[PDB]
Amino acid sequence: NYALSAQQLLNASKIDDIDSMMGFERYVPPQYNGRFDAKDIDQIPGRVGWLTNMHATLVSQENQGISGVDFYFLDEEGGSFKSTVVYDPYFFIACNDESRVNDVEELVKKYLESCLKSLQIIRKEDLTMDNHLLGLQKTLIKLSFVNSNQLFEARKLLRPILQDNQRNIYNVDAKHLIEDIREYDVPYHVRVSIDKDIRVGKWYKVTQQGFIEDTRKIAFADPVVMAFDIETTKPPLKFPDSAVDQIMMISYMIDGEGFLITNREIISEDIEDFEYTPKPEYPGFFTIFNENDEVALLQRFFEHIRDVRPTVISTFNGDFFDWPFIHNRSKIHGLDMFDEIGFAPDAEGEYKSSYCSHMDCFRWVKRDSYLPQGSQGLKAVTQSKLGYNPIELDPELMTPYAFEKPQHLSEYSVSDAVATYYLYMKYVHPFIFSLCTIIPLNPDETLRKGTGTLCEMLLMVQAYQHNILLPNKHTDPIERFYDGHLLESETYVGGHVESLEAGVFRSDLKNEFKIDPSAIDELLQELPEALKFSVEVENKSSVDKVTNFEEIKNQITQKLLELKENNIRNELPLIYHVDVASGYPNIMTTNRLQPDSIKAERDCTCARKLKWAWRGEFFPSKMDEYNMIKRALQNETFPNVLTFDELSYADQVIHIKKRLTEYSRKVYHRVKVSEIVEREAIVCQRENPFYVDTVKSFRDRRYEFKGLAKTMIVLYDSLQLAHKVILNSFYGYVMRKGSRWYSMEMAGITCLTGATIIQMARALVERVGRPLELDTDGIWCILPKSFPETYFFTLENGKKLYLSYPCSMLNYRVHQKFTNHQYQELKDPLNYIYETHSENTIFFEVDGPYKAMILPSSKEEGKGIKKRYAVFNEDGSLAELKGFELKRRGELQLIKNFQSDIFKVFLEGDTLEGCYSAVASVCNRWLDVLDSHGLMLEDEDLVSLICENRSMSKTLKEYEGQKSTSITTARRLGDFLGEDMVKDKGLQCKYIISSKPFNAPVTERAIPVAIFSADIPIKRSFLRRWTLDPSLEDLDIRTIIDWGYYRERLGSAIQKIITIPAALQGVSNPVPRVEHPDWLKRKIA
DNA sequence: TAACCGCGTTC
DNA sequence: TCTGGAACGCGGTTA
Ligand SMILES: Nc1ccn([C@@H]2O[C@H](COP(=O)(O)OP(=O)(O)OP(=O)(O)O)[C@@H](O)[C@H]2O)c(=O)n1
Ligand SMILES: [Ca+2]
Ligand SMILES: [Ca+2]
Ligand SMILES: [Ca+2]
């Protein structure tokens, strides 16, 4: 009813009251009936402020509310204010016929009498419309409304008329010309922010005309920024519960000033003031508020937020723990957190306020940090991004340390707060607010929304600003068939990966090369052109201004000629990485790839016929058994009591696929059948390049960031990764569900074209050297030391121009075989003149030379290991480590600690055999611990090394009908500590494999490690039940551990990184205590 | 055995 | 409701 506007107006009245309490009274700008000129900004009457936030709202006439957006400002005088803007929400109607739009308009004027406020004829460009490249536009009816509810009230009324679309059959209505509705699902506050070009993070003069952007102001304003971490009482071996657990202490930092509140009914002593300063750039003075009760703690917390009026509250995982814990504690205690500090949970359950953004730094880590999930806890993030190791305390030991050593518990509390404040200010604050200047979202949404949604935001701004009609969101095809088979998956062949060699490759050991002579012949033929290519395209200069071109040319010709006569050679190597820079982006731009450019047979040489690969996974069942399964389901009854037809089409196909899955598993002994079909698609080179240019803009931006190559802050590159996070999702947005611009064809052209390029690079490197590993756009390789390497052109300006022949010899061939000579661009739009030119932004980059690269080998004959290796810089430091369990989250700590200790030893020795002998000494030492059943290890160190931690993605209940060590652990954790420990997601499952039950699967022998920290009577009872050994009396873990399972695991690793690779390099087993697979035993003969 | 799955990584 | 992609290692399951 109209009550929705009453509820929403009552919310807006309490928000206004809270805003005023926090210093955000509404500012109405002074009247001026004079002209608005940007140069007159100081003359126009108004208020100037830095935009920090923005929220949609409902306002009254100053009977139903009017939609608007409050904008929250920080003024130059240190104060603050908010200012509202009113804007009628709207969406469009498209027609089937443009000669009868007025007939359509009349009908809509009557059906939506109680909804419509305005109606207007708008013209927009439709990229799906014929001859739209010659100026043709689509006519639309723009329906406007007072507030957002009346818009949704219209959409509810138009759904009947849309779903329908009687007379004598023997020889139209105004309702049947309504085609679809467009731009109906744009979030209101985004619609306003886009139409008015208003962005958080920019300065404005709020005037009665509008917001006047003040480009003179360069820096951000300085908001009051606050961060806090809460520590609570925790049941031993169990998780905390707001229902029964109190808050020990809240620790927080306002603007570099640290504060700590203690609950004196849980904290055993009044704590005196102290300081925690980890690095001198992170100063932590801390003042303590030793309050007696939790009430006095929650109230001091609330009173302090009201005092400092903070516009940014930062947390670390505060949406899941801190905020809902404080909320529940305050509700138990009669406090209403909303009336206190204006904070409350929203639909997604996160905690937000109107006057203040809540910045959970965990959301930044997960999305934009480019950190492995095994390093996304606060401890790791602090080390990698802040540069110190913070205070640590066993969570099993926080609750009792409240009484025994209170100061120690407090030292941990401040540590969490100091890390969170400075992590926010040095990383999340600059990136999020700067991203708000280009993305029409408030800080809360810019921090949390998926990168795919950030891309749609950027693309919608371009579409609106070129008057391009938005496409509706993609609707997923519920069912699709191939050759009569139900497809369970449609996809494209993506990156090309190749393991080519394993073993140890090091700059101080010679390698055997066989140099194709025909390869050097070609390289000599293309050398002159490719050499001009380096100065004029790679370096953007002129061969005439060079002074050493022929010198360098002759020097390169010699090294190649020698390697032509002297083909077979045994010399020291050149370890190199070669990668295409912004590869997938540049491939799309070079080829002018955008979803609206992919078209089928149409009148529309703007061909760009490009190839992609289609892979389909279909049920082996034919359509006839599909119908049988359907009819069988129809004869069945489903719950909500519901016939199969009463169900939604999607739900029906879920059922059909499930029963079809079981039928194929029996009758066909399979579930899916894969078939790869090569396909071709047309890419028009004259389409509106709004998508292509949006990617081009962000790519050129990241080039600048990377161009900040320093040889004192490197955080510049800490943001180039940010541009990459957006660019990568620009390639993925085309396959995203619910996308407005979708084309599998475009994503497949990008992948297949990239594979073609990387295989061309490999095809020549193999004829000139030895390629080691290849993945998507990169190639790890070793080249002879006598191959032409680095050269500097001498310019008449005294300038020096880099030249890596190995790179430019490939770049020239790329620009010779993959250049788009069909790129067309609008020269003069007034008379529609298009001009064609050749475009190729695809370039390779080089890394190295590197001291050492270690590549592991498979346990299966012939196969290699992909996406895993270790590289070392010439100074001994670790350059790259990829794939190994050391980095991965939750692996057997023994393998992680063995790998950390083993890789650095691959640098010692003066021969390939001596390297393996030194690395084997470390292997035998680890084997000694496992064969010593941990005799020289403390029981604590042994559990740490022998425990494997796994994170259950979902809840145990959703894993029904499935067996896993994580499931068995979580089930056994429930039987011992209650069903409450298995309620939240992300359950970390720490377990140990037991020897008994003998002859039993590993999954049935996963004992949770928390049982060994339990009471001695509780220990035996559950161990007995889990070993199936009633006689059990000994409980030393050394007696229960299946030392053989752990020895086989250590052995598998030794075989893949050392023994089997050594055999492929000719060396004999360097760890005979680890025996070779039988196939390798046979090969030695 | 061959086919498949969950997790967490490299692109 | 909100929601970028595919290729790959490893240790387990099932029938
Ligand atoms: N999280 C990621 C990382 C990479 N890619 C894809 O992998 C391609 C190549 O990977 P990479 O070389 O890491 O990306 P580039 O953009 O080429 O970056 P760089 O300049 O470092 O080579 C990217 O273009 C992108 O399409 C992706 O889709 N998602
Ligand atoms: Ca904490
Ligand atoms: Ca790349
Ligand atoms: Ca790179």
Numbering used by the authors: 29 to 90, 111 to 213, 219 to 224, 233 to 665, 676 to 711, 720 to 790, 812 to 1185
Which sentences did the original study use to describe this structure?
The Saccharomyces cerevisiae B-family replicative DNA polymerases, namely Pol ϵ, Pol δ and Pol α, have been estimated to incorporate about 13 000 NTPs during each cell cycle of the yeast genome, and Pol ϵ seems to incorporate the majority of NTPs, roughly four times as many ribonucleotides as Pol δ. Other examples where an amino acid adjacent to the steric gate residue influences ribonucleotide discrimination are found among B-family polymerases. It was first shown in the ϕ29 DNA polymerase that B-family polymerases have a conserved tyrosine (Y645 in Pol ϵ) that functions as a steric gate. Our data show that Pol ϵ discriminates NTPs through the concerted action of a steric gate residue (Y645) and a sensor in the finger domain (N828). A comparison with other B-family DNA polymerases showed that both Y645 and N828 are structurally conserved residues, thus reinforcing their functional importance.
Previous biochemical experiments showed that M644GPol ϵ has an increased propensity to incorporate NTPs, suggesting that M644GPol ϵ might more easily accommodate a ribonucleotide in the active site. A series of crystal structures were determined of M644GPol2CORE (the catalytic domain of Pol ϵ (136 kDa)) in complex with dTTP or UTP and dCTP or CTP opposite the template dA and dG, respectively. The two structures of M644GPol2CORE-UTP and M644GPol2CORE-CTP aligned well in the polymerase active site when the two structures were superimposed. In both structures, the NTPs adopted the same C3’-endo conformation, and the 3′-dideoxy end of the primer terminus was at the same distance from the α-phosphate of the incoming nucleotide as found in structures with a dNTP. Thus, the NTPs were in a position admissible for chemistry to occur if a 3′-OH group were to be present at the DNA primer terminus. The described structural changes were also found when comparing M644GPol2CORE-CTP with M644GPol2CORE-dCTP. However, a small ∼1Å shift in the backbone Cα-atom of the catalytic residue D877 towards the cavity between D877 and Y645 was consistently observed in all M644GPol2CORE structures when compared to wild-type Pol2CORE structures. Here, the M644GPol ϵ variant allowed us to solve the first high-resolution structures of a B-family polymerase with a ribonucleotide in the polymerase active site. Instead, N828 in the finger domain, positioned on the opposite side of the nucleotide (not facing the 2′-OH), had moved 3.1 Å and a loose hydrogen bond with the β-phosphate was disrupted.
